[PDB]
């Protein structure tokens with residue numbers, strides 16, 4: 372079903388995350404972490420304090436697809452075990468965000484072609500710089516397009532809100 376998913380997404384904020392390679396998204400899927408440039412880290416930390424759920428929607432560049440989406444479970448923090456990101460220097464990254472995956476399945480851009488993002492000139496939601504915020508209605512509908520991920524139990528993430 373989609374009811375718990377809709378509950379998690381209610382009044383959420385959404386951010387497009389663009390990765391240059393599949394290895395970084397695989398690492399994020401395995402370890403439940405993300406790291407980004409400070410301009411976006413600051414935006415994500417502000418959003419985390421401001422909304423019940425902050426959703427990151429991942430897309431590997433040139434892949435033609437989104438690779439899933441996850442919910443921020445923490446503000447960024449420094450001093451953890453170093454994540455061996457494959458970058459485009461590691462000091463240039465900000466802190467690390469803990470994330471809880473909501474869907475690890477892919478969605479091709481062909482399926483989201485009817486969704487435009489008001490915060491990026493109503494261009495199709497697939498188009499945007501890393502860190503681009505997606506307006507609430509567009510972001511909710513995009514997340515609802517993903518195939519259900521039956522390996523994830525959202526009871527756990529609901530208890531964090």
Ligand SMILES: CC(=O)Nc1cccnc1
Pocket residue numbers: 390391395405406407408456457458459464501
């Ligand atoms: C994990 C990751 O790929 N972070 C990143 C790299 C380059 C630019 N912005 C963010």
